[PDB]
Amino acid sequence: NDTSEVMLLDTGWEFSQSGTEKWMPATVPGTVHQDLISHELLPNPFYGMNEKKIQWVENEDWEYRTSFIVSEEQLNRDGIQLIFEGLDTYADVYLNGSLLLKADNMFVGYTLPVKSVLRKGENHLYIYFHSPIRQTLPQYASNGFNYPADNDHHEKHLSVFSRKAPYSYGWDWGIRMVTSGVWRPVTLRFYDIATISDYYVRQLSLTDENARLSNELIVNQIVPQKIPAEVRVNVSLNGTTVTEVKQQVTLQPGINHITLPAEVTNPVRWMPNGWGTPTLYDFSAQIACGDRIVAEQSHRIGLRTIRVVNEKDKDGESFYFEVNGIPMFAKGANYIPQDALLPNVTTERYQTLFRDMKEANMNMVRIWGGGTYENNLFYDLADENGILVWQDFMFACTPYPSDPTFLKRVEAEAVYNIRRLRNHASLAMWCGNNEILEALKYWGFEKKFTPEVYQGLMHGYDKLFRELLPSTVKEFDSDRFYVHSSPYLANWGRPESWGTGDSHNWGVWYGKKPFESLDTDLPRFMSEFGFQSFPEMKTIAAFAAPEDYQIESEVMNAHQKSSIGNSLIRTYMERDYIIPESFEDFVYVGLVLQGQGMRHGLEAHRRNRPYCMGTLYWQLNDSWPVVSWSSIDYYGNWKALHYQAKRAFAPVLINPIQQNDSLSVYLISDRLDTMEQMTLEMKVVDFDGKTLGKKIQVHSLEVPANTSKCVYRAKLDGWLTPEDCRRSFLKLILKDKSGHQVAESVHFFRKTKDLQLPPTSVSYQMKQTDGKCELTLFSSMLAKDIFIETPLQGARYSDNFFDLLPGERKKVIITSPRIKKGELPVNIKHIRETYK
């Protein structure tokens, strides 16, 4: 919003495999792999078994070029700046015969002064990407040991040497595609006098009465004269000015530091999803020289406090978030990259993923450390959806080097991304890495390395995670929490450690523990736990053949990367369900299983507030069509788990929990207000619809804000017979004084495999128009865990993976832009259908 002119360098690019002298059109931002695919120079890397057939790319070097025109009038501007938001990774940048940059960190943006190198007329930009494998082979050869990075799918674990997305080398839900390229935008800015290098809105204090801010600017003045200027900051809300402040300065050549206080009286606070509005102010900083605004930069700013409380207490050491002074139970998931090829993730895909977290009642996301520091749009969407962000630095599972050069590269990326992200309302904390200290302690090592190399790794840990990173946070983001590792102390095999900080409870899945264990094995905060599923059939059809459907088949094992995969799924399924004979039915029941088991954990964590203060499941999403722990597949289809997470995260939840042949019912609220004069009503209904016994009523209930409380206990014995338990379910509703329903739940008394489910038809009527299909479903008898299956990729449902209750009609709306007036194919599956 100033006199500068920005040229986007996003057209006219060509690329070439080094040594071929053969050039073709490219798409920038982009990746080498996509550029090849677009010219049918590579097969669909996600299809079938194309993974092995695409690996060759990682051994070549790749060159990119573009030309552009500069006019005499542009060449005459005071300054001209070329900005690379992202280069993956070892890139030699040449412009007009000048080596401008030898890039070496995927996570750093580079700002380059180029006016003295540009020419009137045609200009030639030329980028040389060294193979990150061949670049680091000599480095590895000199190292004399292989770092234990099991997720790096190569004999030589080269990932640890490069500041490049860890997942790109492979992971336990991911394809190996060690790509290269101009992965974020390239801009040329022509400007006068100065640019704003950094604008930081630093909150000094916040009360209901006043927010005090400090506007900290860094201005890079490019001309040799002293330049009188006036710095102005405008604070607005919804287009209307709230306050305005200004400061006279004379800008000196080079860097200038400018600080302007501003205050907002009676500030409208940013609140997280579920507690109100994610209000964002617009803060705009301008540099005005005479009549002209030579430089402007704005941020959207949310006014709130976030405190992470991590303190010794009677239970061990707490780990929770206090938002605007109120302890906030965290509800969310771990986020991984949305694609093997990052530039392929569109604005639309980011918007939809946030819609998916918001609609599932989430208030937090963990950006896990084997991915990337996300793009600005991700954090912008987190801001406007009221989702808190836990940001790992990009270190995961393995110890890393700690030599001076390496720590210099890391320092660059830490400074860059902290300054990049620190104005976001959503940003809640930093975490040095995923599971490295656990790895060092327990994985085990010290049987794997000499004592000397082991000691070096231990000192190397401290240098990076207990010194460099926490110092950098203290300097550049001094009011945000940092912890050196997640989990920082708790280990899932060591019950004595569970009351200390956050847990990754991998007892379920890796430890083979039943889902019931989640009721007893409680953390102070669950930062990971999870369970895998095959994605639904239309997703399998994007990647496998009917031949290719047994699963531990070649491909159906090729698409599983956990240490066991599809073995474990069957093992757990047998505990609770009849294992279906057909592959398609097995896929359906596996979705149901992951949903039901995980939901039982999310409920245990909320039920056990305040001992437990959060649950973030592993994992939200997928990077490609694969078998994984995700609740949303690569094509955006919600698995059962996503619907179940939405239910389990509902602001008010009725939670029936049955153990030791007894039922308790808890009422769980994350509301900010207390509910008074409430009635819990329950009744036992058989699978034919017939009420058994009488309604049970619990009157005069209070549901206080932000609490979980037991309101009802009954022994099963004397109430229902073992036969009644396999033949009926419990219906529960909660209502206010007048009889308006605020919540409902259903409860089963036995495992699904033990239920005497009746054969039944789910019939439906359909009303189909452009973009929309409204179905009304009916079954005279219980239909268990119904799946409404359509072939349309990414179709959205008002509900799915729910029990259709006997004789009770249920409306479901299906939407997709592909739905054309004039029949959407619909296949309704339910549990009884899967066996005979």
Ligand X SMILES: NCCCC/N=C1\N[C@H](CO)[C@@H](O)[C@H](O)[C@@H]1O
Residues at the site binding Br ion, with contacts judged by CB under 5 A: 79, 81, 113, 115, 256-257, 274, 363, 466, 470, 484, 658, 661
3-state secondary structure of 35: helix
Residue 528 touches which member of Cl ion, Br ion, ligand X, none, C-beta under 5-8 Å by kind: ligand X
- Min dist CB 596 to ligand X, Å, is 20
Q: Does 146 bind Cl ion (CB under 5 A)?
A: no
- Stretch 446-475: interaction string toward Cl ion, x if CB under 5 A: ---xx--x----------------------
Q: Which is nearer to ligand X, 181 or 371 (CB)?
A: 371
Give 367 or 641: the residue with its C-beta nearer to Cl ion.
Answer: 641
Count Cβ atoms below 10 Å from residue 278 Cβ, excluding itself: 21
Q: Which region among 166-174, 320-328, 574-582, 753-761 touches ligand X (by CB under 6 A)?
A: 166-174
CB 746 within 8 A of CB 729: yes
As measured in angstroms, the least distance from the Cβ of 396 to ligand X is 6
**Chain centroid to CA 295:** 34
Which residues between 392 and 421 bind ligand X (CB under 6 A)?
Answer: 396-397
**Residue 504 found at the interface with ligand X (CB under 6 A):** yes
Q: Contact between 434 and ligand X (CB under 6 A)?
A: yes
* Cβ neighbours of residue 502 closer than 8 Å, sequence gap 6 or more: 319, 486, 487, 488, 490, 523, 524, 525, 526, 527, 614
Q: Which two tokens stand for residue 358?
A: 């918001």
Angle ∠(414,104,140) on CA atoms, nearest 5: 105
* Residue 434 binds which of Br ion, ligand X, Cl ion, none (CB < 5-8 A, kind-dependent): ligand X
Count CB neighbours of 41 within 10 A: 12
Stretch of residues binding Cl ion (CB under 5 A), selected from 112-120, 138-146, 256-264, 673-681: 138-146
* Cα separation values, 104 from 165, 796, 836, Å: 12, 42, 60
Beta carbons of 617 and 602 less than 8 angstroms apart: yes
Residues after which the chain is discontinuous, using a C–N cutoff of 2.5 Å = 547, 548, 551, 563, 822
Q: At closest approach, how far in Å is the CB of 562 from ligand X?
A: 5
Q: Which does 432 bind (CB under 5 to 8 A by kind): Br ion, Cl ion, ligand X, none?
A: none
C-alpha to C-alpha distance for 275 and 285, rounded to whole angstroms: 30
Per CB under 6 A, the list member of 94, 350, 506, 712 interacting with ligand X is: 506
- For 169, list phi and psi in degrees, rounded to 5: -85, 0
* Contact between 657 and Cl ion per CB under 5 A: yes
Q: How far is the CB of 94 from Br ion (least distance, A)?
A: 17
449 binds, among Br ion, Cl ion, ligand X, none (CB under 5 to 8 A by kind): Cl ion
Binding test (CB under 5 A) with Cl ion, winner from 408, 737, 751, 818: 751
Of the two residues 175 and 685, which places its CB atom closer to ligand X in the complex?
Answer: 175
Q: Return the SS3 of 168.
A: helix
466 touches, from ligand X, Br ion, Cl ion, none (C-beta below 5 to 8 Å by class): Br ion
In the complex, the smallest distance separating the C-beta of residue 323 from Cl ion, rounded to whole angstroms, is: 20
Residue closer to ligand X, measured from CB, 480 or 561: 561
* 3-state secondary structure string across 622-688: CCCCCCECCCECCCCCECHHHHHHHHHCCCEEEEEEEECCEEEEEEEECCCCCEEEEEEEEEEEECC
Please tell me the distance from the alpha carbon of residue 114 to that of residue 122, in angstroms, as a whole number: 14
DSSP H or E run through 62? strand 62-70
Interface positions, 658-687, toward Cl ion (CB under 5 A):
658
Q: Which of residues 515-574 bind ligand X (CB under 6 A)?
A: 528, 562
Interface with ligand X includes 629 (CB under 6 A)? yes
Number of residues this chain uses to bind ligand X (CB under 6 A) = 15
Minimum distance from CB of 381 to Cl ion (Å)?
33
Concatenate the DSSP letters of all residues of 259-286 into one string: EEEEEEES---B--TTSS-B--EEEEEE
Structure-derived torsion over alpha carbons of residues 400, 154, 32, 561, reported in degrees to the nearest 10: -90
> Interface with ligand X includes 778 (CB under 6 A)?
no
Residue 510 interacts with which of Br ion, ligand X, Cl ion, none, CB < 5 to 8 Å by class: ligand X
> What is the closest distance, in whole angstroms, from the C-beta atom of residue 650 to Br ion in the complex?
11
Which amino acid is residue 635, in one-letter code?
Answer: Y
Quick one: 30 or 501, whose CB is closer to ligand X? Answer: 501
Q: Is 549 in the site for Cl ion (CB under 5 A)?
A: no
Cα distances (angstroms) measured from residue 692 to each of 413, 684, 719, 746: 64, 5, 10, 15
Which residues contact Cl ion (rule: CB under 5 A)?
145, 449-450, 453, 576, 657-658, 751-752
Which residues contact ligand X (rule: CB under 6 A)?
171-173, 370, 396-397, 434-435, 504, 506, 510, 528, 562, 618, 629
